[PDB]
């Protein structure tokens, strides 16, 4: 028998969790402090993951999210919602993709939950499912109030590939629109 | 000022090919590891996973740099950063719309151009199926696993709704890998 | 057959993390399912560390700890304690190293908190600071009841260098002894 | 100059992060790249450190362009040294790492018993990270040694300053005297 060794390489910044790194870079370009905290497992199979973004105007001494103090979560995967939402502060805001995420009924009492079909928006209204991270980014910014929206949009546009700037501007504006109109469940 | 704490949860194209391949080999009764990599940079940048497969025990659960048999790449920077670990004369499949090797590379490796993103987006009608196009290409080029065994295993792994598109993706990967010629 | 979720937190070179790995390997060796979930952040320096271990006698559908469902935490660094204890279930068990971790008074009502001077036990009683991971391992296994102790000990001893078995056995035994005597604050 | 350094062990990882933080503190760019695999147990460890005085546009080591490697575990040496540029520097712990003889022609390989130096001469095996740090910084030429020592010394617990300063100075001395195999 032979030992086989195979290498697979792809492009960055494609999933919804890409929203986080853009947001953190945006905060740092403003002169604020930000960390991006990540997680991984010993699992072979791919599965849901998560990125936590921590932003402050003063030194951040703890470069991870404090469980129970998270202000806002956006989730497009049911198991990721169910596994990680327990760290969101009571009365915190959670945006979920209703085509994919199905909270237990009691959750609607603990958190303010909004349904926004981010993936459909990206795929059908923007015309490119890969803009889903920017739809998500705009929604996160608008709901959390963590950063100026015009400041964020500008930074995002300098960060993404030139080829995608048209579509990502539209995706951002649609994210803001949807979050502006969204009502808690 | 306030401290803000935000959580994003989701999910990966070509990476996903590697995971499917490793799980399929383990399901045959072989050994396999998936080795991954990450950075302290705020932006994540290009991605890479290495898949190691053997019938016997694998004592080192990472790729041996200089011994990689096969690489598939859809990102220019990832190609340029990582191909150096591929053995001399090893097989590299690149997406010609996105990856542009320096001319000297064609003398060190056997490089094949397959437009995987276009095949998945246009012929299959679903850009997410690039995972399975890449998987079929990897298996065909590397001979690391029986194509029928892998296709059947993949079919059990994917949701019924996506099965037709994934089977079409797999078949197109094999066709393109079969027809592909190395760049001189 | 229950699903067990354990959280280990340290900093830098505290082998607290190593406890998690041995434990997961031991469960797998028994024929059970186990995942290790790890974390990292966007800086070059190692800071607080956290490893989550998930063990079941059936398929684990989510390879991360479920925030709010963690059964047990062992913590040897104050920042990691304060940052990650929020995911421990109410009434759940937490062991802290009292020379390094300083919970707010309200925490003692929410969780059962035990103080065990892990670093000093390894340093002074075992005479080898690097055995703290084995002290920690025995405490966690005992407190969570996630694995039989006789089986775990044997597995651990085959996992370590032949000439450290005497010290590691003793470390293990002291972990159990201290866990057995400990009372919640 | 862009510097790319690889640290491999099972101690040595910490050397890489101190180096990177010192580079950042002096006003340069630095990233740490890390790797994991699909098992619960920790095995061989490797961290890449990339330093430059301009924007780094790829946050990993470039395989084939690594300037320098320090290795204290055989498996990680055999698995990861292939990414080191031809004629690059590799330092190995000769009590633990055993290169195939053809390696001595491709790379400049120096033998330094880092683990003994920390355990025996400094009297604290944990300071092997600072021994390794000094060797890597000398061998790679990537930073001013005085600045690095002063930054490292601010970074460690005050009670350990004496041990670490000695570990550093020993690192530099053994790297200076070392000859390629």
Automatic annotation (TrEMBL), chain B:
Q: Spell out the InterPro entries in the cross-references.
A: 2-oxoglutarate_synth_KorC, Pyrv/ketoisovalerate_OxRed_cat, Pyrv_flavodox_OxRed_cen
What does the UniProt keyword field contain?
Oxidoreductase
Gene3D superfamilies xrefs: Pyruvate-ferredoxin oxidoreductase, PFOR, domain III
What GO terms are given for molecular function?
oxidoreductase activity, acting on the aldehyde or oxo group of donors
Q: Which residues form the Pyruvate/ketoisovalerate oxidoreductase catalytic domain?
A: 12-174
Q: Read off the Pfam families from this record.
A: POR (PF01558)
This protein is called OORC subunit of 2-oxoglutarate:acceptor oxidoreductase
Provide the species name.
Answer: Campylobacter jejuni subsp. jejuni serotype O:2 (strain ATCC 700819 / NCTC 11168)
Origin organism lineage = Bacteria, Pseudomonadati, Campylobacterota, Epsilonproteobacteria, Campylobacterales
């Amino acid at each position: 028998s032979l030992k086989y060794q195979l290498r697979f390489g792809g492009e960055g910044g494609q999933g919804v969790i890409t929203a986080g790194e853009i947001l953190a870079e945006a905060a740092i370009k403003e002169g604020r402090q930000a960390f991006k905290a990540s997680t991984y497992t010993s699992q072979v199979r791919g599965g849901p993951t998560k990125v936590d973004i921590i932003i402050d105007d003063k030194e951040i001494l703890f470069p991870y999210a404090v469980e129970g103090e998270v202000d806002f979560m956006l989730s497009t995967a049911d198991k990721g919602y169910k596994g990680f939402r327990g760290g969101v502060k009571e009365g915190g805001i959670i945006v979920v993709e209703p085509n994919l995420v199905h909270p237990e009924s009691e959750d609607y009492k603990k958190w303010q939950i909004f349904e926004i079909p981010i993936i459909t928006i990206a795929k059908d209204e923007v015309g490119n499912v890969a803009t889903q991270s920017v739809v998500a980014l705009a929604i996160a910014a608008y709901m959390s109030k963590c950063i100026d929206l015009d400041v964020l949009k500008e930074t995002m546009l300098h960060m993404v590939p030139a080829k995608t700037r048209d579509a990502n501007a539209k995706a951002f504006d649609l994210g803001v629109k949807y979050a502006t109109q969204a009502k808690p469940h």
